[PDB]
Every structure is written in structure tokens, then in C-alpha cells.
Design a protein around this ligand. Structure first.
Ligand SMILES: OC[C@H]1O[C@@H](O)[C@H](O)[C@@H](O)[C@H]1O
Ligand SMILES: OC[C@H]1O[C@@H](O)[C@H](O)[C@@H](O)[C@H]1O
Ligand SMILES: OC[C@H]1O[C@@H](O)[C@H](O)[C@@H](O)[C@H]1O
Ligand SMILES: OC[C@H]1O[C@@H](O)[C@H](O)[C@@H](O)[C@H]1O
Ligand SMILES: OC[C@H]1O[C@@H](O)[C@H](O)[C@@H](O)[C@H]1O
Ligand SMILES: OC[C@H]1O[C@@H](O)[C@H](O)[C@@H](O)[C@H]1O
Ligand SMILES: [Cl-]
Ligand SMILES: [Cl-]
Ligand SMILES: [Cl-]
Ligand SMILES: [Cl-]
Ligand SMILES: [Cl-]
Ligand SMILES: [Cl-]
Ligand SMILES: [Cl-]
Ligand SMILES: [Cl-]
Ligand SMILES: [Mg+2]
Ligand SMILES: [Mg+2]
Lengths: 346, 346
């Protein structure tokens, strides 16, 4: 490679053959990726290679329901572009334009019928969407708006009953959401407020008991969360603080026992974390340090051995990596590269 | 409730809200079920209640891609019948016939497009299939044959690239298989032999690195296995023994770190098990005893806390249950009921 709260520097996925693979942007605006040779914690890595392209957003990988990876990014023309594996353990297509004019990172999820649907902000700050017309396949539909006025990147997650739901910060800095009223459809609710005051993009997970749960940095730079009180349904809970003082977006992942764990940069620029204790319904630990000096939010993912691995940019712009060991966490190691923050909303 | 190697006595699922739920048959041939109140190991259970019906196969539950449970069973007329939740956290439809004449338990899997496809043996011992025409929905297609001559219940599993693949014992007692050549299609291979000599139904998993792997009791009543050597592809490995002397079908589940674990009844009628050590690519432990006196194969499943829970019938015909603890395994507890072995092939 050539020499809102702060964003994640990469998009990551645990692939259909149990390998972690990360996607980032270099100084000349190409998308690069790096992947484990082997499905295990501490595997050697491929090194960075270029998928080319010229991007003005975070590149966002999603796995099709046939296992083919696909990467979505905004182009220098502000259209949505994508590139995909032509077969599950094979090479990549060329970049192709899906048109439109977008003003955020793209957010992607599979409908229950295997059709990817992509969400992105438009020039008037409304939310727009486009989708595959058949399972993991073009042609794509035409773009349409779900309205709203949003001031963060959008985040999408499917409910435990198959209904897509999108979250985003509003002009007032509250968290807003909107949802399919039926799976696989274009029947959507009105936008509704979940109040609060957020200063990062929202991070969304579906818990082990089927409740959507949203994490976000608050006005006070603590980590807050809120959730559906019953499976795939409102009413929502109150906003609740998980404390901390954080200087980047939060990342959240599930341990293999479904204990949630949140990661974020601290006031000392180290990686900090907090996790549920004992089980997925337990209380949260105090924030604790994983050291390092990082220049992006962290990106967390669970690997094929069931361990959380966390990636973050260093002061040198290389991507570094630390992972859970039986005892503790490993010392940071460098994967090299020279990565830039290409987020469409900063 | 009213007062090949041996089969499993129940079908089990970890539901979309993290609850285990089991389905069995009573003396009067109705399908009954029992489920955890709460998404945790050692949760209280509902007790047994009847979904009615009159069945002559194991009832087999599958979770639609919108989270609705659906149960498939052969009727006393030898047709395939089914019943489904009308909404993800709600009640059940009535039993409805999908017609045909079948001579095995049904085997079910979701295509990459969300369409359930059901496989079952016919009156000439060929394999037949029928499917939903749209994602998690009727109407259903008409029945069609994939030929072959089979002498065990069939087992289906999707490859890590979205291709369905069906396994079954042949007239010669070898393991045979057949596969989609493309996802979501009716384009299937010829039947092909994987040789060996098997004396149970095949049990199939997809490993953490995307390889199908099949377990079966051998001629010598040891547990054998065989696998794809690369992700979603032949060539297959040699048959390899995991030893043991087993008096029921094997059940296999993944620990939350992806270590495979096999369970089966022993010569002393206790539950025995063997597991991969250290990680998902590790070697297998020696067989060890979990006690009990059981009158069916075990049924294994991983719960919402990431623990394996194992169910088996007792000498009294109640369903008993034991689960992993931090240290060890819990003492057997009774869930009651009076369950019969209704398997269409014994
Ligand atoms: O040509 C449009 C492309 O759309 C992608 O989303 C799909 O994964 C590709 O297979 C191709 O159809
Ligand atoms: O808060 C009310 C709404 O909550 C949403 O999260 C849910 O998807 C809707 O179906 C409705 O329940
Ligand atoms: O460093 C201490 C902590 O590390 C976390 O990742 C893990 O979830 C906790 O169980 C505890 O081990
Ligand atoms: O009426 C046919 C039924 O087929 C089931 O497989 C489906 O889950 C039901 O919703 C219903 O369509
Ligand atoms: O053994 C040869 C075959 O093995 C199957 O398991 C696989 O699904 C096929 O695509 C082909 O590779
Ligand atoms: O009883 C001893 C064994 O129990 C198994 O279920 C588990 O996979 C092993 O890790 C070991 O604990
Ligand atoms: Cl570059
Ligand atoms: Cl707009
Ligand atoms: Cl999630
Ligand atoms: Cl930068
Ligand atoms: Cl009964
Ligand atoms: Cl037939
Ligand atoms: Cl599996
Ligand atoms: Cl019986
Ligand atoms: Mg994977
Ligand atoms: Mg579940």
C-alpha cells in the first residue's frame, strides 16, 4: 500500500469457510483486503491486496446467502458501486455502478428471501434503498426513499421475525428508527423517535433472545444502550448508561456464549472494553484496558475458534490486531497496510 | 400424556428467541411439544402439550427464515403433513396435507432463497422432494423424484456455498449422496457412493471451515465419520473410525467454539460421548460416560447460553435431560411425558 465519533477503519467478516477478512481504503482511494490463510485464531494473513476502485465511503462487506462476499461503497461520482465474488471460494467481479446519489456509507442486510437490500442517505438527507430482485442476484430494483432527515450513517438489522429495521441519528441528535411491517416487502412504518442524544453512529445487534439492541455514544461521551423489551417488538426500554469516557464509535460483538462485549477508544487513546458477565442476561463489567494507541474506532468479530478478535488503526496507519486467549488478550500485532478514514459522514 | 440403530425420540430446535423446544409422539400418535420458559440453561419447562395429529413418522421441526417453527410428519394415510406457527411468537395452524406417499421420516432444509424443501423416501424406495414456492410460504410445488434406492431415512444439509445435499444408506449399506449443482434449483447430480458400511441413519454437519461431514454407526458398531476435503467440495476423505461400541444412532452438535461432539447410547445403556479437544481442528477424546439408562438415541443441541443440552428417553418413557456445566455435566432430570418411537424406518 502507498505511504460523529471517529469511525471504524475496516469492514470485517467471518467467511463461509471460517476465515476473517477485512476491507479498507488506501491513500489513493482503492479498496484493499487482507484475510486469514487458516480458520484459526492467530492464523497467518494474506497481506493487503487491491480490489481497485475509487471510493468516498467506508467499503462495507456483506455475505450473500450463497456465501459469496460482496462489497458496497460510494464512488467519487457519489453513486453506489459494488463488487462481488463470482463464486464462494473464487475471485472477484469488476466494480459495477448501481447509480443514485448518496451521502452516507451504505448499510446492507439480507431479507428472509435472500435478497440483499442496501440503505443509504441521499442529497436531502432522507434514507433511500435498493435491492437484489432475486436471491443473491441482480438485476437490482430501482432506488426509492423512506424519507426522514438523518445526520449519521444508517444501520440496518433484521428482527428475529424477519423484518428489516433501520436506525439513524435525526437532526435533533436523537435516535430514530423505521421498520418493515412484513418481511420481504416494501411496506414500511413511519419513522419514530427513540429519543436520547447520540454522538456516534448507532451499532445494532440482535440478542440471543431475539431483541434488537442499539448502542451509541451519548452527549457525555459515555456508552449508552437501549432495546426492544420483547422479541422483535416494542415497547422499547429506557436509554441506559454503560458509563465509560469514549473517544471513538463503539463496536459490539457476541462472545460464543452470547455475552455481549463493547469496545471503544479511551481518553488515553488505548482500546477499552466492557462485557456482560456470567451469561447473556448478566450485568456489565467495569471498563478495562486492552492497551495500544489507536487512531480509529475498533472493529470486533468472533472467529472460527469462537474468540473475539479486534482490529484498529495505529499511529503509523497500519491495521493492528489483538484477540482473546484462554487467560486474557494477546499483545497487539501489526497487519501492516496504510489505511485512511474514508467515511462519507465524519 | 397417555400412559438401523435405535432412533432419536424427539426433534429439537433453538428458537428465534433463544428457547429450546422439543417435539415428540405419544401412544395415541399425536405430536406433543415442550419448551423452555426462559432462554437459559436449566430454565423451567412448559410441560407437554398436544399439537394433535396422527403420525407414523418422527415429527421433524424446522425453523423458517422468518423464525416461524414448522413441523413435518407422515400421516396414517402415508402422506406428508405439516403444521406451522402462524406468527413467530404465536400459535399454530391446523395440520394440512402435502399429499404424496412416503416411506421415511421427512428431511428438511431451507434453500438460500428461504424456500423450505422437504425430502422423503417413496414406495419404490427412491428419494422424492417438494418445496415452498416462495420464501417461507406455500403454495407448495408438486412432488418429484431424484431416484436412487435407499434403506435409511434421508438427511439433508446445505453446503457452505448454498447447494443442498442429501445423504442416505443404499441397498448395499454404503453411504450415498446427491447434490444440487446450483442453489435454489432443480439441477441435481447423479447419486454417488461414499462406500463404507453403515448401520445407522447418517448425521450431517457443516464444519466451521465450510466442509460437510457425515457421522454414522458402522458394521462393527463403532462411530465412523467422513468429510469433504475442501470447502463445499469433493474429493471426500476416507472413512475414519472414532471407535466406541454404540447401541443407538449418534447425535452430533457443535460446542460454541465449534468443537464437534458426538453422543450415543453405550453397551451399558448409558449416554456416552466423545468431543474434539482444544479447537475445531483438534483430535477426538476417548469415549466417556454421562450415565443414565436410556431407551432412545440422544438428541443434542446448543442452547442460548452456549451450552450443549442432551435429551433422551428413559426406561419409564419420560424424556430426560442433562447439560454442560462449567465443571462437568448436570445430573439427569425428567421432563416427564410418555413418548414412543414413531420412526418410519426402524
Ligand atoms: O450483476 C449484478 C450483481 O449483483 C450482485 O449483488 C450479485 O451478487 C452479483 O451476482 C450480480 O448479480
Ligand atoms: O416500538 C414499536 C415498534 O418497535 C419496532 O422495533 C418493531 O419492529 C415494530 O414492529 C413495533 O413493535
Ligand atoms: O480480559 C478479561 C475479559 O476478556 C473479555 O473479552 C471476556 O469477555 C471476559 O470473559 C474476560 O476474559
Ligand atoms: O398453507 C401452506 C403453508 O405452508 C407452510 O410451509 C408455510 O410455513 C405456511 O405459512 C403456509 O403457507
Ligand atoms: O465428490 C464430488 C462432489 O462432492 C459433493 O459433496 C459436492 O457437493 C459436489 O459439488 C462435488 O464436489
Ligand atoms: O465432561 C467433560 C467434557 O464435556 C464435554 O461436553 C466438553 O465438550 C468437554 O470440553 C469436556 O468438558
Ligand atoms: Cl489506494
Ligand atoms: Cl434525499
Ligand atoms: Cl447480532
Ligand atoms: Cl485518515
Ligand atoms: Cl398421543
Ligand atoms: Cl419411490
Ligand atoms: Cl451444522
Ligand atoms: Cl416405542
Ligand atoms: Mg463463518
Ligand atoms: Mg436461536
Amino acid at each position: 500500500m502507498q505511504p460523529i465519533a471517529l469511525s471504524e477503519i475496516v469492514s470485517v467478516v467471518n467467511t463461509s469457510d471460517g476465515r476473517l477478512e477485512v476491507f479498507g481504503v488506501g491513500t489513493d482511494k482503492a479498496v484493499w483486503h487482507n484475510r486469514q490463510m487458516a480458520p484459526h485464531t492467530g492464523s497467518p494473513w494474506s497481506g493487503w491486496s487491491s480490489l481497485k476502485g475509487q471510493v468516498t465511503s467506508k467499503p462495507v462487506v456483506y455475505i450473500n446467502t450463497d456465501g459469496r462476499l460482496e462489497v458496497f461503497a460510494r464512488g467519487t461520482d457519489n453513486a453506489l458501486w459494488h463488487i462481488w465474488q463470482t463464486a464462494t471460494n473464487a475471485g472477484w467481479s469488476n466494480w459495477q455502478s448501481l447509480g443514485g446519489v448518496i451521502t452516507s456509507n451504505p448499510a446492507i442486510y439480507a431479507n428472509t428471501d435472500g435478497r440483499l437490500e442496501v440503505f443509504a442517505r441521499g442529497a436531502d438527507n432522507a434514507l433511500w434503498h435498493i435491492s437484489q430482485t432475486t436471491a443473491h442476484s441482480g438485476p437490482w430494483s430501482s432506488w426509492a426513499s423512506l424519507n426522514g432527515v438523518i445526520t449519521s450513517n444508517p444501520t440496518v438489522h433484521i428482527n428475529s421475525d424477519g423484518r428489516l429495521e433501520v436506525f439513524a441519528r435525526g437532526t435533533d441528535n436523537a435516535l430514530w428508527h423505521i421498520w418493515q411491517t412484513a418481511p420481504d416487502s416494501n411496506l414500511w412504518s413511519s419513522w419514530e423517535s427513540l429519543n436520547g442524544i447520540i454522538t456516534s453512529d448507532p451499532v445494532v445487534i440482535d440478542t440471543a433472545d431475539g431483541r434488537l439492541e442499539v448502542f451509541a455514544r451519548g452527549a457525555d461521551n459515555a456508552l449508552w444502550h437501549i432495546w426492544q423489551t420483547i422479541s422483535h417488538s416494542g415497547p422499547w426500554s429506557g436509554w441506559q448508561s454503560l458509563n465509560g469516557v469514549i473517544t471513538s464509535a463503539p463496536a459490539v460483538a457476541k462472545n460464543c456464549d452470547n455475552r455481549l462485549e463493547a469496545f471503544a477508544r479511551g481518553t488515553d487513546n488505548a482500546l477499552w472494553h466492557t462485557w456482560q458477565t456470567v451469561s447473556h442476561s448478566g450485568p456489565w463489567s467495569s471498563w478495562q484496558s486492552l492497551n495500544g494507541v489507536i487512531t480509529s474506532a475498533p472493529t470486533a468479530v468472533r472467529d472460527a475458534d469462537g474468540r473475539l478478535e479486534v482490529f484498529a488503526r495505529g499511529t503509523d496507519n497500519a491495521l493492528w490486531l489483538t484477540w482473546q486467549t484462554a487467560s486474557s488478550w494477546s499483545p497487539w500485532i501489526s497487519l501492516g497496510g496504510v489505511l485512511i478514514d474514508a467515511s462519507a459522514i465524519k
